[PDB]
């Protein structure tokens, strides 16, 4: 059955609380999350505090991560830790030894990679004795650093990205398997949607233990089709099913690791229903690892330079009370506690090259022919899945997935995306 969790934004001080955590408030924060019926949280230490020198990891920062995990467990939550932030809510947190006079690419500078390796090992080893420590993600949407849009871009080609993922995941993959924990990585949706982007779809769907997707309908979907359109309400289920096309394993779990109802496209009055119906569509996709809502506690209004909608994403308001979206999410957990999605047997076909990479990612981005073909089949009640053209010509893969019907469409780029 699906797991239900929340991305943990500390009340009152946000991630600025890591300098001097208020453990009694954090204990209360985590207790509130558990009261929703959530079974896990995802937490975010800051790279700048963890590793202020390339060869010195701050022991107090590690002990603070340990204490937050410990409090998560005492609240009855499994705790997932993102190692490298890196990036959170429009802000970059990059240690001084990788900035300006020391500027470097985290993806290709060998000394930086060895530092990220040491940090990954230090986080795992710090937490490894804890019953509540459930697994690690390399870091939140690290691919945003290498995208051509980034104003201080860290360069990398696709081969170097694959090596970066393999290096860091390979440090802990064996331990995670024998310990019963998970190792994953996380990209924003440029990996699915942006042609020329150095993170490739198959990286998300084949590397690490589960696929992560982050579903944000401010990516042009809500603006182009309407915030409460089938395209918008189904966007998270679309990412789940799209991602499986690029998976070698036919029942690999897909983790909707971040999803929210962004107020820059969805009116606040629609956000509870956006939450309920988005989770309804996700729950009708097989093999969903879980849904992790963004986020637990609203950002205090005294903090500046956030995009305004980021402040409202919290399930709990600044005074600690449960919002209407929080109620919807609580109710969605109860609704889908034991939901089992039936197999999906009609697949749309993604044309790919001989390496299994899309001929045109823009066609599966919002506004694209493949995006809309899936959305139309979904609106017609046909419950589509997604396959590549390579797999379409392999009956063993089709049989293992139960696919009996194939729908094909031409490649047409969308222009609604970002």
> By CB under 8 A, is residue 97 in contact with a copy of itself?
yes
Round to whole Å and give the CA distance between 76 and 65. Answer: 17
> What strands lie across the sheet with 405-407, from one edge to the other?
385-388, 346-350, 405-407
**CA 42 vs CA 111, 159, 299: distances in Å:** 28, 29, 17
> By CB under 8 A, is residue 119 in contact with a copy of itself?
no
Query: Which positions from 177 through 206 interact with a copy of itself, judged by CB under 8 A?
Result: none
Of 168, 179, 237, nearest to 203 by C-alpha is: 168
- CB-count burial class (<10 Å; 0-12, 13-18, 19+) for 195: middle
Number of residues that bind a copy of itself (CB under 8 A): 33
CB-nearer residue toward a copy of itself: 112 or 348: 112
Q: Which residues contact 117 (CB under 8 A, 6 or more apart)?
A: 167, 168, 171
Residue-by-residue DSSP string for 36-99 = TT--EEEE---HHHH-SBTTB--HHHHHHHHHHHHHHHHTT-EEEEE----EETTEE---GGGS
Contact region with a copy of itself (CB under 8 A), list: 148-156, 166-174, 340-348, 402-410 = 148-156
Contact region with a copy of itself (CB under 8 A), list: 73-81, 87-95, 278-286, 321-329 = 87-95
> By CB under 8 A, is residue 23 in contact with a copy of itself?
no
Position among 60, 174, 379, 408 found at the interface with a copy of itself (CB under 8 A): 60
Instruction: Report H helices in 198-318.
Output: 201-206, 221-225, 230-233, 235-245, 271-283
> By CB under 8 A, is residue 53 in contact with a copy of itself?
yes
Q: Say if residue 13 carries a ligand binding annotation.
A: no
CB-nearer residue toward a copy of itself: 52 or 250: 52
Position among 1, 23, 74, 102 found at the interface with a copy of itself (CB under 8 A): 102
> By CB under 8 A, is residue 92 in contact with a copy of itself?
yes
Element (H, E) at 135: strand 133-137
- Tokens standing for residue 64: 């603070």
How near is the Cβ of 310 to a copy of itself at its closest, in Å? 12
> By CB under 8 A, is residue 93 in contact with a copy of itself?
yes
> By CB under 8 A, is residue 67 in contact with a copy of itself?
no
- Coarse DSSP helix, strand, coil percentages of the chain, rounded to the nearest 5 percent: 45, 15, 40
> By CB under 8 A, is residue 56 in contact with a copy of itself?
yes
> By CB under 8 A, is residue 66 in contact with a copy of itself?
no
- CB-count burial class (<10 Å; 0-12, 13-18, 19+) for 252: middle
Query: Which positions from 297 through 356 interact with a copy of itself, judged by CB under 8 A?
Result: 302-305
**Cα(first)–Cα(last) distance of the chain, in Å?**
34
Q: Say if residue 141 carries a ligand binding annotation.
A: yes
CB-nearer residue toward a copy of itself: 104 or 414: 104
> By CB under 8 A, is residue 169 in contact with a copy of itself?
no
> By CB under 8 A, is residue 54 in contact with a copy of itself?
yes
CB-nearer residue toward a copy of itself: 97 or 294: 97
Query: Which positions from 32 through 51 interact with a copy of itself, judged by CB under 8 A?
Result: 48-49
How near is the Cβ of 84 to a copy of itself at its closest, in Å? 14
Contacts with a copy of itself by CB under 8 A lie at 16, 19-20, 48-49, 52-56, 58, 60-61, 90-94, 96-97, 99-103, 111, 150-152, 302-305
Known binding-site positions: 87, 90, 141
Annotated binding site for N-acetyl-D-glucosamine: 87, 90, 141
């Amino acid at each position: 059955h699906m797991k239900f969790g929340v991305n943990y934004t500390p009340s009152g001080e946000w991630f600025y609380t890591w300098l001097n955590p208020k453990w009694e408030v954090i204990r209360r924060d985590l207790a509130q999350i558990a009261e929703l019926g959530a079974d896990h949280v995802r937490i975010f230490p800051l790279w700048t505090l963890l590793q202020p020198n390339r060869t010195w990891i701050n022991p107090k920062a590690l002990a603070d991560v340990r204490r937050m995990v410990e409090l998560g467990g005492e609240a009855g939550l499994d705790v997932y830790v993102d190692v490298i932030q890196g990036h959170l809510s429009s802000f970059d947190f990059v240690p001084s030894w990788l900035v300006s006079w020391h500027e470097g690419s985290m993806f290709t500078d060998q000394s930086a990679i060895e530092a990220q390796s040491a940090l990954t090992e230090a986080i795992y080893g710090t937490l490894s004795d804890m019953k509540a420590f459930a697994g690690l993600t390399l870091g939140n949407e690290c691919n945003q650093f290498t995208d051509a849009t980034h104003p201080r871009r860290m360069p990398a080609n696709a081969e170097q990205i694959g090596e970066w993922l393999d290096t860091l995941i390979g440090l802990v993959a064996k331990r995670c398997r024998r310990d019963g924990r998970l190792i994953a990585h996380s990209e924003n949706d440029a990996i699915w949607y942006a042609d020329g982007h150095a993170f490739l779809p198959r990286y998300a769907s084949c590397k690490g233990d589960v696929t992560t997707v982050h579903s944000w309908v401010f990516n042009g979907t809500g603006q182009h089709y309407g915030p409460m359109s089938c395209e918008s309400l189904g966007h998270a289920a679309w990412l789940v099913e799209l991602s499986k096309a690029f998976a070698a394993d036919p029942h690999r779990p897909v983790w909707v690791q971040a999803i929210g109802a962004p107020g820059n496209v969805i009116d606040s009055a629609d956000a509870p229903e956006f939450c309920r119906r988005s989770i309804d569509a996700i729950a009708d996709c097989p093999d969903v690892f879980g849904v992790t809502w963004w986020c637990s506690h609203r950002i205090p209004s005294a903090f500046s330079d956030f995009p305004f909608f980021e402040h409202q994403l919290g399930l709990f308001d600044v005074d600690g009370t449960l919002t209407d979206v929080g109620k919807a999410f609580r109710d969605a957990i109860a609704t889908h506690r034991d939901t089992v999605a039936p197999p999906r047997t009609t697949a749309i076909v993604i044309p790919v090259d001989e390496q299994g990479d899309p001929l045109m990612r823009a066609a599966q981005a919002p506004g694209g022919s493949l995006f809309e073909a899936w959305a139309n089949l979904n609106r017609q009640g046909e419950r589509p899945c997604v396959i590549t053209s390579l797999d379409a010509g392999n009956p063993a893969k089709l049989a293992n997935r139960g696919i009996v019907r194939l729908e094909r469409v031409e490649l047409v780029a969308g222009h609604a995306y970002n």
